[PDB]
Design an enzyme around this catalytic site. Structure first.
Site, mmCIF file in Angstrom:
data_model
loop_
_atom_site.group_PDB
_atom_site.id
_atom_site.type_symbol
_atom_site.label_atom_id
_atom_site.label_comp_id
_atom_site.label_asym_id
_atom_site.label_seq_id
_atom_site.Cartn_x
_atom_site.Cartn_y
_atom_site.Cartn_z
ATOM 1 N N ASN A 33 -14.702 -16.695 -73.283
ATOM 2 C CA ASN A 33 -14.099 -15.574 -73.109
ATOM 3 C C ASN A 33 -15.324 -14.884 -72.082
ATOM 4 O OD1 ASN A 33 -11.859 -15.399 -75.269
ATOM 5 N ND2 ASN A 33 -13.798 -15.980 -76.521
ATOM 6 N N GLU A 52 -4.705 -6.113 -75.322
ATOM 7 C CA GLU A 52 -6.185 -5.699 -75.982
ATOM 8 C C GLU A 52 -6.563 -4.263 -75.332
ATOM 9 O OE1 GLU A 52 -8.678 -9.316 -76.829
ATOM 10 O OE2 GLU A 52 -7.562 -10.165 -75.308
ATOM 11 N N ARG A 88 -18.278 -15.235 -74.495
ATOM 12 C CA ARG A 88 -18.613 -15.612 -75.669
ATOM 13 C C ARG A 88 -17.666 -16.974 -76.113
ATOM 14 N NH1 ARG A 88 -14.960 -12.369 -78.425
ATOM 15 N NH2 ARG A 88 -13.603 -14.190 -79.083
ATOM 16 N N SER A 94 -4.417 -12.725 -76.499
ATOM 17 C CA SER A 94 -3.868 -11.783 -77.711
ATOM 18 C C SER A 94 -2.967 -12.706 -78.601
ATOM 19 C CB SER A 94 -3.471 -10.587 -77.216
ATOM 20 O OG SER A 94 -2.839 -9.831 -78.183
ATOM 21 N N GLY A 132 -14.973 -8.789 -76.514
ATOM 22 C CA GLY A 132 -14.920 -7.313 -77.110
ATOM 23 C C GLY A 132 -16.297 -6.934 -77.309
ATOM 24 N N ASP A 141 -16.098 -19.934 -78.199
ATOM 25 C CA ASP A 141 -15.789 -19.900 -79.509
ATOM 26 C C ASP A 141 -15.355 -21.590 -79.745
ATOM 27 O OD1 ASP A 141 -15.437 -17.431 -79.298
ATOM 28 O OD2 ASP A 141 -13.570 -17.105 -79.155
ATOM 29 N N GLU A 150 -12.415 -21.870 -76.808
ATOM 30 C CA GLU A 150 -12.275 -21.151 -75.607
ATOM 31 C C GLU A 150 -13.356 -20.404 -75.017
ATOM 32 O OE1 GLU A 150 -9.421 -17.722 -75.967
ATOM 33 O OE2 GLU A 150 -9.775 -17.953 -77.863
ATOM 34 N N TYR A 171 -6.185 -2.470 -104.935
ATOM 35 C CA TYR A 171 -5.795 -3.138 -103.728
ATOM 36 C C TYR A 171 -6.761 -2.999 -102.412
ATOM 37 C CZ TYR A 171 -3.347 -4.899 -99.671
ATOM 38 O OH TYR A 171 -3.098 -5.597 -98.558
#
Lengths: 322, 322
Positions: free
Chosen positions: B287, B16, B271, B162, B291, B273, B285, B232
Site C-alpha cells: 500500500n 476510503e 505498508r 476497500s 491509512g 501486508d 499487497e 455486549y
C-alpha cells in the site's frame, strides 16, 4: 445524430516532439470525425486554437502560451487522442490527467503506459509470462553493478526514450562512466546484452487487450553510398513490409506480440519491436503511442494488413469508447 | 530562510474517503511545516481554503465546489502530500497530474503506484523477483477461467481496493457469478487461493527505493462478546505491535518487504501486508498510501520503531525532495 468531436493533442516535451507534430497534419486530414488540435510546446506550455494550427507550419513548436492545466473546455470532446511520445506522453502521466478529467482517450491506460515505458519492469512481467526478452539486469545509482554476462552490452536509463543517455559498453572499464551518464536521466538503468548480427522486426496490434496483429515488418539500414549517376546518397532507414521472414517465424512474432499485449492489458494500439538472432526471437519493446506519420511503421503495417489510414484512426477512436 | 510550504490533499472519491479525511486532522496538527489543505469531495469536486477546513468537521465531504483541475496556485508549495487512498489516489492518476505540474510529492511515483494497485501485475513482478505470493491467476471478461487450484478461493477486481466486488467462492458453481460481479468494477479480475488458518502481518518501510523497515505488526480479530460487567461488546480489529513472531520470522518479513520495495522502485513509504501460514510467508499487497490516522498501523509501527509522528511526516516531505 451530431458529429462526434475529437481532440488531438500533439507535440510534447520529449525529444520526439517533432515526430509528433509531423503526425498531427496527417491525423487532422484523415481522422473520419471533426477534430480539434492542441499542441504541447517543447517548453511544456500549451498552444490552443489558432496558435496550435499555425504551429503545424514548422517542424517544431518551442512556443507555448498556456501553463500546463490548459484553458481547454474538455467537455466539448467525446474522445482525446494524446499523440505524444515518450516522457510525458506514453508514460501514464497524461493518461492519469485525462482519467481525472473523466475523458475517454486513445491507447493504453495508466498502468500499461507506465509499465511499457519502464525497460526493467516491463521485462520482468514479460519474462514472468514466458515471453523471450534479451538477458538484462537493472542497476540503481549507488548500487554495485553485477552484470551476469559478456562485456558487449547496452546501458540505458530505464524510463526514457529516443536513445538519450544510452551507451554501448565495449569494456567493463567503461561501465562506470556509462551508468553515471544514464543516471543523469533516471536513477534506474538497465544493462542489456548486445546481440550481433541480429535483425529488427516490428508488428502492430490493434484492439483492447485481445487484439489483432498486422503483418510483420523489418527495419533495415541502408548505408550511405556513391551512386553512379547521383553521386553521394545519405544513409537511410528502410522499412520492409512484409518482412522477408521464413515460414513460421512471422506467425511466432505475431503470437508473442499479441500475448505480451494481452498480459500487459494494453488498450487501443501498440507497435511491438523484436530482435531476431540465430533463429531466436526476443521482445525488444512495446510502444503504446508509435509514430503516426505517413513514413511511420505502425500505420504502414496496418495498411498492408488491409486497414486504411482513416479506418485505423476511426477504430482507435471507437476502441477508446469501449 | 522562509518556512517550507506543504499542501495536503485529502478525501478522495474512493470508498476510503472517510479514512483519508480522518487522517488530515492529524497530519495538519503534526506536520512540522506550515501546511495548507485541499479536499477532494466524494463527488470528485474539490474544496479549497475555508470550505476545506470546515469539511474536517464531518466524517465525510460529499460536497465539492471546484470541477477537477482546481483553481489552486500550486506554485505556493514546495511539496504536495496526496493522502488519498485507492482508486484516484494510489493508482498513479493524481501522481501523473502532479508530475505534469512539476510538483514534488510524497510517496510512490506513477509507475510504482499503478503497479502496486494492480493485483495481477504486481504479483507477476514479485514472483519474477523471487518474492513469495499466494498462487493466483488473472481472468479477463470473456475469457474462460482456468484456476489451477482448489475451490476455496477469492475472486476480486484487479485494480480496486476497500474489498469492493470481492467474493469468497466455495464451489466452482459460484465462480461464474463471482467474476461477473468483479467485472462490474474492472474488466480484469484475479482469483487467489484462500489460506486457512493464516495470520496477517504488516510492516512499514520508509525511504526512497532502499528503505528502512519498521518492526512487524499483526492484525488480529477480536470477536464480539458478552462481558461480565459491560455486557455486549462489538467485534474489533486488534493491531498487535510488535507481532508475537518466532525468532527469525520477523527478520524474514522485513527482508521480503524491503526487497519488494526496492524491486518495484517505491519512493517515500509503503505498508507491506503479508500472510503467514504453515510457517510460510506470502507477500499479500503493498500500500503506497497507507491509512495515516492515530489508530492506523503504518504510523504506529514506525512509532514503535522510534520514529515520532511529526518526525515521520517530516521525513516523508524530505524524501519527496530527494
Amino acid at each position: 445524430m451530431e458529429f462526434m468531436r475529437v481532440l488531438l493533442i500533439a507535440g510534447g516535451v520529449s525529444p520526439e516532439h517533432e515526430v509528433s507534430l509531423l503526425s498531427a497534419e496527417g491525423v487532422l486530414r484523415h481522422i473520419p470525425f471533426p477534430t480539434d488540435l492542441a499542441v504541447i510546446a517543447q517548453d511544456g506550455r500549451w498552444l490552443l486554437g489558432e496558435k496550435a494550427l499555425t504551429a503545424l507550419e514548422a517542424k517544431a513548436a518551442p512556443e507555448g502560451e498556456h501553463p500546463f492545466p490548459p484553458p481547454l473546455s474538455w467537455e466539448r470532446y467525446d474522445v482525446v487522442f494524446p499523440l505524444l511520445h515518450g516522457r510525458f506522453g506514453e508514460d501514464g502521466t497524461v493518461q492519469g490527467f485525462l482519467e481525472l478529467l473523466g475523458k475517454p482517450y486513445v491507447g493504453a491506460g495508466v498502468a500499461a503506459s507506465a509499465l511499457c515505458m519502464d525497460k526493467d519492469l516491463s521485462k520482468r512481467v514479460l519474462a514472468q509470462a514466458g515471453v523471450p526478452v534479451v538477458p538484462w539486469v537493472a542497476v540503481r545509482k549507488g548500487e554495485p553493478p553485477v552484470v551476469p554476462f559478456d562485456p558487449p552490452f547496452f546501458v540505458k536509463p530505464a524510463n526514457t526514450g529516443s536513445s538519450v543517455g544510452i551507451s554501448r559498453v565495449e569494456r567493463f572499464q567503461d561501465l562506470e562512466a556509462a551508468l553515471a551518464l544514464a543516471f543523469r536521466y533516471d536513477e534506474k538503468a538497465v544493462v542489456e546484452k548486445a546481440l550481433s548480427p541480429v535483425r529488427e522486426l516490428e508488428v502492430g496490434v490493434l484492439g483492447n487487450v485481445f487484439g489483432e496483429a498486422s503483418p510483420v515488418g523489418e527495419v533495415r539500414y541502408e548505408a550511405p553510398f556513391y551512386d553512379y549517376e547521383t553521386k553521394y546518397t545519405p544513409g537511410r532507414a528502410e522499412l520492409l513490409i512484409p518482412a522477408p521472414l521464413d515460414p513460421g517465424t512471422q506467425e511466432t512474432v505475431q503470437e508473442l506480440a499479441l500475448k505480451a499485449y494481452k498480459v500487459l492489458g494494453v488498450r487501443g494500439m501498440a507497435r511491438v519491436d523484436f530482435f531476431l538472432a540465430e533463429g531466436e526471437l526476443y521482445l525488444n519493446e512495446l510502444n503504446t503511442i508509435p509514430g503516426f506519420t505517413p513514413t511511420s511503421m505502425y500505420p504502414r503495417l496496418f495498411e498492408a494488413g488491409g486497414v486504411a489510414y482513416p479506418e485505423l484512426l476511426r477504430r482507435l477512436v471507437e476502441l477508446a469508447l469501449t
